[PDB]
Design an enzyme around this catalytic site. Sequence first.
Site, PDB file in Angstrom:
ATOM      1  N   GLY A   5      -3.430  -1.794   5.397  1.00  0.00           N
ATOM      2  CA  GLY A   5      -3.861  -3.477   5.178  1.00  0.00           C
ATOM      3  C   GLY A   5      -4.071  -3.597   3.559  1.00  0.00           C
ATOM      4  N   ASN A   6      -4.724  -4.740   3.407  1.00  0.00           N
ATOM      5  CA  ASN A   6      -5.094  -5.105   2.136  1.00  0.00           C
ATOM      6  C   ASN A   6      -6.642  -5.797   2.073  1.00  0.00           C
ATOM      7  OD1 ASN A   6      -4.804  -8.173   1.761  1.00  0.00           O
ATOM      8  ND2 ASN A   6      -2.728  -7.515   2.419  1.00  0.00           N
ATOM      9  N   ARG A   7      -6.899  -5.873   0.847  1.00  0.00           N
ATOM     10  CA  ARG A   7      -8.394  -6.506   0.787  1.00  0.00           C
ATOM     11  C   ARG A   7      -8.729  -7.842   0.738  1.00  0.00           C
ATOM     12  NH1 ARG A   7      -9.896  -1.687  -2.081  1.00  0.00           N
ATOM     13  NH2 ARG A   7     -10.683  -0.306  -0.587  1.00  0.00           N
ATOM     14  N   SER A   8      -7.466  -8.741   0.990  1.00  0.00           N
ATOM     15  CA  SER A   8      -7.725 -10.379   0.895  1.00  0.00           C
ATOM     16  C   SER A   8      -8.817 -10.662   1.915  1.00  0.00           C
ATOM     17  CB  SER A   8      -6.560 -11.007   0.918  1.00  0.00           C
ATOM     18  OG  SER A   8      -6.338 -12.125   1.562  1.00  0.00           O
ATOM     19  N   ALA A  47      -2.254 -12.693   2.376  1.00  0.00           N
ATOM     20  CA  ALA A  47      -1.843 -11.683   1.685  1.00  0.00           C
ATOM     21  C   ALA A  47      -0.894 -10.795   2.631  1.00  0.00           C
ATOM     22  CB  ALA A  47      -3.045 -10.560   1.100  1.00  0.00           C
TER      23      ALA A  47
END
Lengths: 224, 213
Positions: free
Chosen positions: A27-30, A95
Amino acid sequence: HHDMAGVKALVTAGGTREPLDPVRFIGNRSSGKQGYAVARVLAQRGADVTLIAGNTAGLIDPAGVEMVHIGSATQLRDAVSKHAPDANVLVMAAAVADFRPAHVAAAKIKKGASEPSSIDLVRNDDVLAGAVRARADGQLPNMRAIVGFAAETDVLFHARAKLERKGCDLLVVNAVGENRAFEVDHNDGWLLSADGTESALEHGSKTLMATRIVDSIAAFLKSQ
Amino acid sequence: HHDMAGVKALVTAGGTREPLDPVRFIGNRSSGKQGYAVARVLAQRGADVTLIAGNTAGLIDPAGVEMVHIGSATQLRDAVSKHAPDANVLVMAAAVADFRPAHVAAAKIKPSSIDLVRNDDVLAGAVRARADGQLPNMRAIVGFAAETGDANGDVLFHARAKLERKGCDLLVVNANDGWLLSADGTESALEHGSKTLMATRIVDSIAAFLKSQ
Ligand SMILES: Nc1ccn([C@@H]2O[C@H](COP(=O)(O)OP(=O)(O)OP(=O)(O)O)[C@@H](O)[C@H]2O)c(=O)n1
Ligand SMILES: Nc1ccn([C@@H]2O[C@H](COP(=O)(O)OP(=O)(O)OP(=O)(O)O)[C@@H](O)[C@H]2O)c(=O)n1
Ligand SMILES: O=C(O)C(=O)c1cn(-c2ccc(O)cc2)c2ccc(Br)cc12
Ligand SMILES: [Ca+2]
Ligand SMILES: [Ca+2]
């Protein structure tokens, strides 16, 4: 001014989660809060809004907005290609993970007693580039504005170039940050139009940047 | 009643995120709701609770509980080893990641496979530490597991194997029921309910195990 009345707008927001197995993922932190604010401000200025959202569970659904929930980047691509023919404006604030695990295990991968092995990666499709192509191929006759998002660290050299390679009408650069204490003010936020105007993006609240983005869309909608 | 008065409890909850870079990471889907509820119920019943919290569903810090926020499993290990000497009860309800990326970029990475390195087993380190006389105040070490039956064995066989391999005093197993597996060989069914009510049964087990002594 209810300047977005009569406009059907489609927004993506949040990060994607690319499954490795049923429990783990990349995942990503957005947080998605900024795409949520754009959708909120659009709805508040009269637009008919559909919001495709990823990892945004603890966020409040914006009032007056039709919610579509996704998990993966491919699901987001599949969801965008469904709701896009009906849109006048596309806002790609999500994102989207550029890569996903090449293989998905059907069960959770047990911890080995011996060396672990890598996650092979595969490219995810460029949802913004696909939409831009569809429009250019005559497949999106209602699309009046395609808005992209970018995080860049000149800034304009990287920003102006993303605009040409994606081919969208507006690129929102560095609409990042809550304007929170001890977050770096890089005076780097820019509103980049395919016509070549550069606007500075005051790093303020998510609401003020959303107003700036929506101000820019309606002004691009009136240019034509 | 306030049966946990005088007890110092250290709780982990949520999943860890193992950074690849400032934006991307490897995570898991654990919500953390059940560890928080255990932390909330322990505090309400008199205990001094420290909750080491990782990634959650947007959960509010329980009132009256000392919060330690972590990101990675390595950061989680450091936090546990820092607070453990003071604790009487360890409840490892966090979904601790088994592996982390071998390299972390300080800036965003614009085919390569992700090379992985194994993370430390914090629950197991705690069990061995106690047995080595390094944690004299530790009275109960509680692990968590979600187990399924498969081609290699039934759900209960796999869960017992977990208890036996982890060595903790109590294993709270999810199969929405499951079991409570004790180091004395006691096995209780875990009646499904809310996170709050199941947390009540978990603490009752801890309390009943504290009276074992
Ligand atoms: N697979 C992808 C990746 C990104 N995007 C969209 O394209 C825009 C640009 O995202 P960016 O993070 O800059 O990704 P890339 O342009 O592909 O380049 P990089 O990974 O190097 O940042 C974003 O609005 C995002 O919504 C997309 O639609 N599909
Ligand atoms: N690096 C790790 C991994 C797990 N845990 C703890 O160990 C317990 C069991 O988690 P689980 O993943 O089920 O044990 P594993 O041996 O990792 O199980 P598996 O090999 O089946 O993935 C949980 O309380 C978790 O908090 C831990 O302390 N440190
Ligand atoms: O905290 C939560 O939200 C949650 O519901 C749970 C998470 N785990 C879990 C933790 C770490 C691990 O390695 C495997 C499983 C649980 C195990 C049993 C029960 Br009963 C509930 C949970
Ligand atoms: Ca990208
Ligand atoms: Ca594991």
